[PDB]
């Protein structure tokens, strides 16, 4: 019962994020008297024979070509084991084994793809589906060889003369690792592999960062870099547990992200309403960087940001955790949103199990913000703080949240979590709510984007405007509050990203931005008087054979579309959803 | 749009003003409709009407283009097809609309005091501009005075249009202005009947829709302007430009009315729970009082009997009225007896006659301390708990304090037992400052010991008023007024250091100003009246000079913001006293040779309201 109480909802159903565990998935055994081992064997056979794939999984009908490829790849693994060869099946080599297969009915790639799925779900092939930069074009044969190589790279405890604060030169790493490959004929595949697992990330054009070799906290004055300023924002994370390698991977990701930002400020991008994300909201010139196994400080023109592990014990709930403090004399706290997106990305990629709650609904992680009013009153102790979920739930509705210990002393949200109030961009770009005759009527709907957000027809300063508004709520409960805060946070991240990409662009043939608002979370673009290209194009297409718009007009429209695409490509921005419906006419 | 719901108004030309949009701007487009359903006579009549409409088009275009004033509806453009032209469209519709809306829920001044004055000024300014242009209105009314802002800090609030929603001259327009003033002040139409001929005969015979009195309208100068405007003899009616000049007088802005009580013997001012503006008359058996409520202009209590000895002051302490009588006694009555408080609830003895009072609240005790400034310069301390007086006094001796800390010569004139006159609280009531002769003494409200001595003036001078104020920067600053010197001096409360002087005996305070470091009797100061962030200084001449501070490189420059005097207060004699009766009300009391007292009440304006007034005149002058 206990292990179900740790995994079952109070209602008796499966708790959110947990597997489907019941009495039928529980057993106990002894190893000397062999008590219950027969029972467990029978239970395994029962669940396996009861496994539905489609027909039952055990003994399911599968093409003989797929099985022949299974024996072929097994034979290739055995050959390379005998040959002491490197265990990468390249896409070309897998395709060759497919070609070498007798009586092969695999003729187009999709049949092979299904076969690959089989070979993965039977423990024949190992795969890490990273489609970025064609890194997907590799498959693995032996878990043992994989683990041995990863332990060999992890085993390298180079001195400070070798590991320059965690980075080792590419040639040095290539030489040190010879014995299980790492030749000139395999270096590219090996470094691709290590990058996929985030074991040896590229560093400048000189070295690779190994996150388990980060230096200890150096004897540097990390407190003398702090300013006694009012432009201070702080966040504190509490964690039920700290994943092994959490800090190393986390810190390495900020390091490489700062490096690529520094390079670009001197290649995956996005456009249109799309799932793809990027830290386009972060535009900061660094001045100095300090980093160590359990934290990092970055100092930039106008301020700094510090992250460090801390013994967080809010409400006597001592557990793992960390503190983040960002100061910026220009009220630009985009670095904190940058760190927030990095936290989310790291957890989702490598510790996604942590994105959950306990069986009773208690979050595995929690976030709090120290209260400016209570900190001022005290200025330690269990000073007051605001739940991040309540902060985001209040920022979307109100400019204000009450202080618990000082009910009648206002705390401004913008002095609490400015990333949810846009203290970064110039005030001139703000959209005045009093001047917007927004309407949410179904007849006011101008369009819809891929973000789930709705573009309405409205008036701003007497101008006809296309206002993209975000609708977040989906109808006292803990889970409701949590889901609501998460959705609002994601919508605000999308808000910042879209604002950054819109403000960063100015071309004749791109829809310009009028302003951005917080209450409601929406922003205004120019509204097309002639609706979409698709509309007028169909209207003129009905009554002609070719060139419905006219010769010169057709040529000019083609030129304008090409010019817009060229401008975006010069900006390294990719459309990915070019179509007549989103090309608007003026 | 020609829709019936788009109709904004109609003019006397038979033409229709519609609501429309031009370049995204909301516009009032006057369009002309000419057709009235092969025939020769039809063609002839049609051409004639079109010609007349075009003549009207040209005339209206000429008169609109020829004019540019802040308070006239401007012209956007003129069109031929259709024959129409666009004017600015009023967001708030007509003056009549909002005026009725606010009139339903008030008695007088529906728009607010400052807003009503500003609207009257703007209408007068527009009429003056038209008269300077030799243009005559002849149809001035609430329906064609259109509204653009209902704010008081806004520059423009209204403009006059040529459309609504025999012999004529400026006096006729001024008569109509008087009617518009009636509607503004009352909020109701001049309903003299339903037949306009009989309304006109009534008006010509001096019959008017008479409103209440200055005590009720509380804007007497506008009422006088009003009554003078519709004078049945047009030759006596004011000129519009003269009204434009008059409105710039702050006396119009702030004076509300005056109220006279006849013969009395003395005046006192209290906090306003009761005895808000009390006058004392009689003696012994016939001793009595008369109370004026300044917010209503009424005497709810008139010569109500209160037997006993003559009183110098009466301190109201949360329920209890502490009457300082000349028999060296404080007779403490309570409000439970309502007005006829003949039986005292306590009688507290003193070694000298009580000349003034102060009630300092001890919030840490949720109690009060009544400090009575006696006739000999000494201070009597009476604790008060929930309105219950105590007999266990603490008498503070100025001479003992001098012997202890200040060490003034025993031969000095400062040793005179000069009566305590002024008393004030400073540092959130942490200290009490009271005037003794040329000097001032600071009592620590915790130990009740005389802690400090200040010297705003030197012997044989005497300080008669002491009032604490604070600048907007949080600098708490205390004035001290002298009788002999006829001047005030300003100290910093947190340092006890003199930092400015303001001479009051100025025959012509033309923008009178003085620095601040980081007929002869008519100029004599009366009292310090701290109102919001300004200080009103009444003088014996009937005029009160209001001063504030201008910031200059951290130092300050004290300066007059306005000089105030209602000339109509002349018959009531010399100004004897004054008080601040509310946050937005001030009173000043005159006595004449008959010992007949009069009360004149002014709007208790601060820096904000005076600045809005003067800035409005300066800015509108610049537009």
PDB file of N, CA and C in Angstrom, chain B residues 524-584:
ATOM      1  N   UNK B 524      -0.771  94.852   9.341  1.00  0.00           N
ATOM      2  CA  UNK B 524      -0.356  94.036  10.476  1.00  0.00           C
ATOM      3  C   UNK B 524      -0.911  92.626  10.321  1.00  0.00           C
ATOM      4  N   UNK B 525      -0.060  91.627  10.543  1.00  0.00           N
ATOM      5  CA  UNK B 525      -0.481  90.242  10.393  1.00  0.00           C
ATOM      6  C   UNK B 525      -1.453  89.854  11.501  1.00  0.00           C
ATOM      7  N   UNK B 526      -2.271  88.841  11.225  1.00  0.00           N
ATOM      8  CA  UNK B 526      -3.284  88.364  12.164  1.00  0.00           C
ATOM      9  C   UNK B 526      -2.910  87.000  12.728  1.00  0.00           C
ATOM     10  N   UNK B 527      -2.756  86.006  11.857  1.00  0.00           N
ATOM     11  CA  UNK B 527      -2.576  84.627  12.287  1.00  0.00           C
ATOM     12  C   UNK B 527      -1.885  83.863  11.162  1.00  0.00           C
ATOM     13  N   UNK B 528      -1.273  82.738  11.519  1.00  0.00           N
ATOM     14  CA  UNK B 528      -0.692  81.803  10.560  1.00  0.00           C
ATOM     15  C   UNK B 528      -1.736  80.724  10.307  1.00  0.00           C
ATOM     16  N   UNK B 529      -2.094  80.522   9.039  1.00  0.00           N
ATOM     17  CA  UNK B 529      -3.083  79.520   8.646  1.00  0.00           C
ATOM     18  C   UNK B 529      -2.433  78.552   7.665  1.00  0.00           C
ATOM     19  N   UNK B 530      -1.986  77.403   8.162  1.00  0.00           N
ATOM     20  CA  UNK B 530      -1.355  76.394   7.319  1.00  0.00           C
ATOM     21  C   UNK B 530      -2.436  75.597   6.602  1.00  0.00           C
ATOM     22  N   UNK B 531      -2.536  75.777   5.285  1.00  0.00           N
ATOM     23  CA  UNK B 531      -3.539  75.110   4.464  1.00  0.00           C
ATOM     24  C   UNK B 531      -2.802  74.282   3.425  1.00  0.00           C
ATOM     25  N   UNK B 532      -2.940  72.959   3.514  1.00  0.00           N
ATOM     26  CA  UNK B 532      -2.234  72.042   2.628  1.00  0.00           C
ATOM     27  C   UNK B 532      -0.732  72.326   2.681  1.00  0.00           C
ATOM     28  N   UNK B 533      -0.132  72.786   1.578  1.00  0.00           N
ATOM     29  CA  UNK B 533       1.289  73.103   1.530  1.00  0.00           C
ATOM     30  C   UNK B 533       1.558  74.600   1.403  1.00  0.00           C
ATOM     31  N   UNK B 534       0.541  75.441   1.595  1.00  0.00           N
ATOM     32  CA  UNK B 534       0.689  76.890   1.578  1.00  0.00           C
ATOM     33  C   UNK B 534       0.356  77.454   2.950  1.00  0.00           C
ATOM     34  N   UNK B 535       0.722  78.717   3.161  1.00  0.00           N
ATOM     35  CA  UNK B 535       0.437  79.421   4.406  1.00  0.00           C
ATOM     36  C   UNK B 535      -0.317  80.698   4.067  1.00  0.00           C
ATOM     37  N   UNK B 536      -1.505  80.847   4.646  1.00  0.00           N
ATOM     38  CA  UNK B 536      -2.302  82.057   4.523  1.00  0.00           C
ATOM     39  C   UNK B 536      -1.990  82.956   5.713  1.00  0.00           C
ATOM     40  N   UNK B 537      -1.704  84.222   5.431  1.00  0.00           N
ATOM     41  CA  UNK B 537      -1.394  85.230   6.440  1.00  0.00           C
ATOM     42  C   UNK B 537      -2.459  86.312   6.321  1.00  0.00           C
ATOM     43  N   UNK B 538      -3.520  86.271   7.128  1.00  0.00           N
ATOM     44  CA  UNK B 538      -4.470  87.389   7.148  1.00  0.00           C
ATOM     45  C   UNK B 538      -3.871  88.636   7.779  1.00  0.00           C
ATOM     46  N   UNK B 539      -4.339  89.791   7.305  1.00  0.00           N
ATOM     47  CA  UNK B 539      -3.908  91.089   7.799  1.00  0.00           C
ATOM     48  C   UNK B 539      -5.126  91.895   8.235  1.00  0.00           C
ATOM     49  N   UNK B 540      -4.872  92.941   9.030  1.00  0.00           N
ATOM     50  CA  UNK B 540      -5.966  93.749   9.566  1.00  0.00           C
ATOM     51  C   UNK B 540      -6.724  94.479   8.466  1.00  0.00           C
ATOM     52  N   UNK B 541      -6.095  94.686   7.310  1.00  0.00           N
ATOM     53  CA  UNK B 541      -6.732  95.418   6.228  1.00  0.00           C
ATOM     54  C   UNK B 541      -7.831  94.656   5.515  1.00  0.00           C
ATOM     55  N   UNK B 542      -8.108  93.417   5.919  1.00  0.00           N
ATOM     56  CA  UNK B 542      -9.087  92.579   5.262  1.00  0.00           C
ATOM     57  C   UNK B 542      -8.518  91.700   4.172  1.00  0.00           C
ATOM     58  N   UNK B 543      -7.239  91.860   3.841  1.00  0.00           N
ATOM     59  CA  UNK B 543      -6.592  91.063   2.813  1.00  0.00           C
ATOM     60  C   UNK B 543      -5.724  89.981   3.442  1.00  0.00           C
ATOM     61  N   UNK B 544      -5.739  88.805   2.819  1.00  0.00           N
ATOM     62  CA  UNK B 544      -4.966  87.649   3.260  1.00  0.00           C
ATOM     63  C   UNK B 544      -3.995  87.292   2.145  1.00  0.00           C
ATOM     64  N   UNK B 545      -2.704  87.260   2.473  1.00  0.00           N
ATOM     65  CA  UNK B 545      -1.651  86.952   1.509  1.00  0.00           C
ATOM     66  C   UNK B 545      -1.242  85.497   1.693  1.00  0.00           C
ATOM     67  N   UNK B 546      -1.257  84.736   0.603  1.00  0.00           N
ATOM     68  CA  UNK B 546      -0.966  83.307   0.629  1.00  0.00           C
ATOM     69  C   UNK B 546       0.410  83.090   0.019  1.00  0.00           C
ATOM     70  N   UNK B 547       1.267  82.368   0.742  1.00  0.00           N
ATOM     71  CA  UNK B 547       2.656  82.172   0.356  1.00  0.00           C
ATOM     72  C   UNK B 547       2.973  80.684   0.288  1.00  0.00           C
ATOM     73  N   UNK B 548       3.878  80.356  -0.634  1.00  0.00           N
ATOM     74  CA  UNK B 548       4.445  79.028  -0.759  1.00  0.00           C
ATOM     75  C   UNK B 548       5.942  79.129  -0.969  1.00  0.00           C
ATOM     76  N   UNK B 549       6.602  78.017  -1.292  1.00  0.00           N
ATOM     77  CA  UNK B 549       8.050  77.977  -1.473  1.00  0.00           C
ATOM     78  C   UNK B 549       8.375  77.461  -2.868  1.00  0.00           C
ATOM     79  N   UNK B 550       9.318  78.123  -3.538  1.00  0.00           N
ATOM     80  CA  UNK B 550       9.845  77.677  -4.821  1.00  0.00           C
ATOM     81  C   UNK B 550      11.241  77.099  -4.623  1.00  0.00           C
ATOM     82  N   UNK B 551      11.482  75.930  -5.211  1.00  0.00           N
ATOM     83  CA  UNK B 551      12.761  75.252  -5.049  1.00  0.00           C
ATOM     84  C   UNK B 551      13.820  75.907  -5.928  1.00  0.00           C
ATOM     85  N   UNK B 552      14.988  76.190  -5.343  1.00  0.00           N
ATOM     86  CA  UNK B 552      16.103  76.805  -6.063  1.00  0.00           C
ATOM     87  C   UNK B 552      17.393  76.188  -5.529  1.00  0.00           C
ATOM     88  N   UNK B 553      17.945  75.234  -6.280  1.00  0.00           N
ATOM     89  CA  UNK B 553      19.243  74.626  -5.990  1.00  0.00           C
ATOM     90  C   UNK B 553      19.324  74.065  -4.575  1.00  0.00           C
ATOM     91  N   UNK B 554      18.219  73.533  -4.057  1.00  0.00           N
ATOM     92  CA  UNK B 554      18.144  73.045  -2.700  1.00  0.00           C
ATOM     93  C   UNK B 554      17.632  74.063  -1.704  1.00  0.00           C
ATOM     94  N   UNK B 555      18.065  75.315  -1.811  1.00  0.00           N
ATOM     95  CA  UNK B 555      17.472  76.376  -1.016  1.00  0.00           C
ATOM     96  C   UNK B 555      16.050  76.631  -1.497  1.00  0.00           C
ATOM     97  N   UNK B 556      15.337  77.496  -0.781  1.00  0.00           N
ATOM     98  CA  UNK B 556      13.970  77.821  -1.161  1.00  0.00           C
ATOM     99  C   UNK B 556      13.793  79.328  -1.261  1.00  0.00           C
ATOM    100  N   UNK B 557      12.787  79.720  -2.031  1.00  0.00           N
ATOM    101  CA  UNK B 557      12.403  81.114  -2.199  1.00  0.00           C
ATOM    102  C   UNK B 557      10.925  81.197  -1.849  1.00  0.00           C
ATOM    103  N   UNK B 558      10.624  81.695  -0.655  1.00  0.00           N
ATOM    104  CA  UNK B 558       9.243  81.926  -0.303  1.00  0.00           C
ATOM    105  C   UNK B 558       8.666  83.049  -1.139  1.00  0.00           C
ATOM    106  N   UNK B 559       7.432  82.859  -1.598  1.00  0.00           N
ATOM    107  CA  UNK B 559       6.839  83.803  -2.535  1.00  0.00           C
ATOM    108  C   UNK B 559       5.324  83.754  -2.429  1.00  0.00           C
ATOM    109  N   UNK B 560       4.697  84.908  -2.666  1.00  0.00           N
ATOM    110  CA  UNK B 560       3.242  84.989  -2.691  1.00  0.00           C
ATOM    111  C   UNK B 560       2.726  84.338  -3.965  1.00  0.00           C
ATOM    112  N   UNK B 561       1.715  83.487  -3.820  1.00  0.00           N
ATOM    113  CA  UNK B 561       1.022  82.904  -4.960  1.00  0.00           C
ATOM    114  C   UNK B 561      -0.202  83.726  -5.346  1.00  0.00           C
ATOM    115  N   UNK B 562      -0.782  84.445  -4.388  1.00  0.00           N
ATOM    116  CA  UNK B 562      -1.939  85.286  -4.653  1.00  0.00           C
ATOM    117  C   UNK B 562      -2.216  86.148  -3.430  1.00  0.00           C
ATOM    118  N   UNK B 563      -2.809  87.314  -3.676  1.00  0.00           N
ATOM    119  CA  UNK B 563      -3.299  88.200  -2.626  1.00  0.00           C
ATOM    120  C   UNK B 563      -4.816  88.246  -2.742  1.00  0.00           C
ATOM    121  N   UNK B 564      -5.495  88.035  -1.619  1.00  0.00           N
ATOM    122  CA  UNK B 564      -6.926  87.779  -1.581  1.00  0.00           C
ATOM    123  C   UNK B 564      -7.621  88.821  -0.717  1.00  0.00           C
ATOM    124  N   UNK B 565      -8.684  89.419  -1.251  1.00  0.00           N
ATOM    125  CA  UNK B 565      -9.522  90.318  -0.463  1.00  0.00           C
ATOM    126  C   UNK B 565     -10.848  90.514  -1.176  1.00  0.00           C
ATOM    127  N   UNK B 566     -11.941  90.206  -0.484  1.00  0.00           N
ATOM    128  CA  UNK B 566     -13.285  90.499  -0.965  1.00  0.00           C
ATOM    129  C   UNK B 566     -13.659  91.892  -0.475  1.00  0.00           C
ATOM    130  N   UNK B 567     -13.754  92.841  -1.409  1.00  0.00           N
ATOM    131  CA  UNK B 567     -14.012  94.230  -1.041  1.00  0.00           C
ATOM    132  C   UNK B 567     -15.340  94.371  -0.308  1.00  0.00           C
ATOM    133  N   UNK B 568     -16.303  93.502  -0.621  1.00  0.00           N
ATOM    134  CA  UNK B 568     -17.616  93.556   0.014  1.00  0.00           C
ATOM    135  C   UNK B 568     -17.561  93.300   1.514  1.00  0.00           C
ATOM    136  N   UNK B 569     -16.434  92.822   2.040  1.00  0.00           N
ATOM    137  CA  UNK B 569     -16.260  92.639   3.473  1.00  0.00           C
ATOM    138  C   UNK B 569     -15.919  93.934   4.203  1.00  0.00           C
ATOM    139  N   UNK B 570     -15.739  95.042   3.481  1.00  0.00           N
ATOM    140  CA  UNK B 570     -15.391  96.321   4.106  1.00  0.00           C
ATOM    141  C   UNK B 570     -16.366  96.785   5.184  1.00  0.00           C
ATOM    142  N   UNK B 571     -17.692  96.705   5.012  1.00  0.00           N
ATOM    143  CA  UNK B 571     -18.596  97.268   6.032  1.00  0.00           C
ATOM    144  C   UNK B 571     -18.488  96.607   7.396  1.00  0.00           C
ATOM    145  N   UNK B 572     -17.912  95.411   7.487  1.00  0.00           N
ATOM    146  CA  UNK B 572     -17.872  94.646   8.724  1.00  0.00           C
ATOM    147  C   UNK B 572     -16.667  94.985   9.595  1.00  0.00           C
ATOM    148  N   UNK B 573     -15.853  95.961   9.193  1.00  0.00           N
ATOM    149  CA  UNK B 573     -14.802  96.476  10.049  1.00  0.00           C
ATOM    150  C   UNK B 573     -13.442  95.847   9.831  1.00  0.00           C
ATOM    151  N   UNK B 574     -12.620  95.858  10.876  1.00  0.00           N
ATOM    152  CA  UNK B 574     -11.252  95.358  10.822  1.00  0.00           C
ATOM    153  C   UNK B 574     -11.270  93.848  10.997  1.00  0.00           C
ATOM    154  N   UNK B 575     -10.358  93.169  10.304  1.00  0.00           N
ATOM    155  CA  UNK B 575     -10.218  91.727  10.463  1.00  0.00           C
ATOM    156  C   UNK B 575      -9.553  91.446  11.803  1.00  0.00           C
ATOM    157  N   UNK B 576     -10.237  90.694  12.659  1.00  0.00           N
ATOM    158  CA  UNK B 576      -9.737  90.408  13.997  1.00  0.00           C
ATOM    159  C   UNK B 576      -9.044  89.055  14.064  1.00  0.00           C
ATOM    160  N   UNK B 577      -9.623  88.017  13.459  1.00  0.00           N
ATOM    161  CA  UNK B 577      -9.091  86.668  13.638  1.00  0.00           C
ATOM    162  C   UNK B 577      -9.276  85.870  12.354  1.00  0.00           C
ATOM    163  N   UNK B 578      -8.822  84.619  12.384  1.00  0.00           N
ATOM    164  CA  UNK B 578      -8.998  83.707  11.262  1.00  0.00           C
ATOM    165  C   UNK B 578      -8.671  82.295  11.723  1.00  0.00           C
ATOM    166  N   UNK B 579      -9.049  81.321  10.900  1.00  0.00           N
ATOM    167  CA  UNK B 579      -8.857  79.921  11.250  1.00  0.00           C
ATOM    168  C   UNK B 579      -8.943  79.053  10.003  1.00  0.00           C
ATOM    169  N   UNK B 580      -8.387  77.850  10.119  1.00  0.00           N
ATOM    170  CA  UNK B 580      -8.579  76.792   9.135  1.00  0.00           C
ATOM    171  C   UNK B 580      -9.593  75.810   9.702  1.00  0.00           C
ATOM    172  N   UNK B 581     -10.792  75.800   9.125  1.00  0.00           N
ATOM    173  CA  UNK B 581     -11.895  75.010   9.656  1.00  0.00           C
ATOM    174  C   UNK B 581     -12.006  73.640   8.998  1.00  0.00           C
ATOM    175  N   UNK B 582     -11.445  73.455   7.806  1.00  0.00           N
ATOM    176  CA  UNK B 582     -11.427  72.156   7.152  1.00  0.00           C
ATOM    177  C   UNK B 582     -10.223  72.109   6.226  1.00  0.00           C
ATOM    178  N   UNK B 583      -9.964  70.923   5.671  1.00  0.00           N
ATOM    179  CA  UNK B 583      -8.849  70.782   4.743  1.00  0.00           C
ATOM    180  C   UNK B 583      -9.037  71.635   3.497  1.00  0.00           C
ATOM    181  N   UNK B 584     -10.287  71.926   3.122  1.00  0.00           N
ATOM    182  CA  UNK B 584     -10.597  72.719   1.938  1.00  0.00           C
ATOM    183  C   UNK B 584     -11.490  73.911   2.272  1.00  0.00           C
TER     184      UNK B 584
END
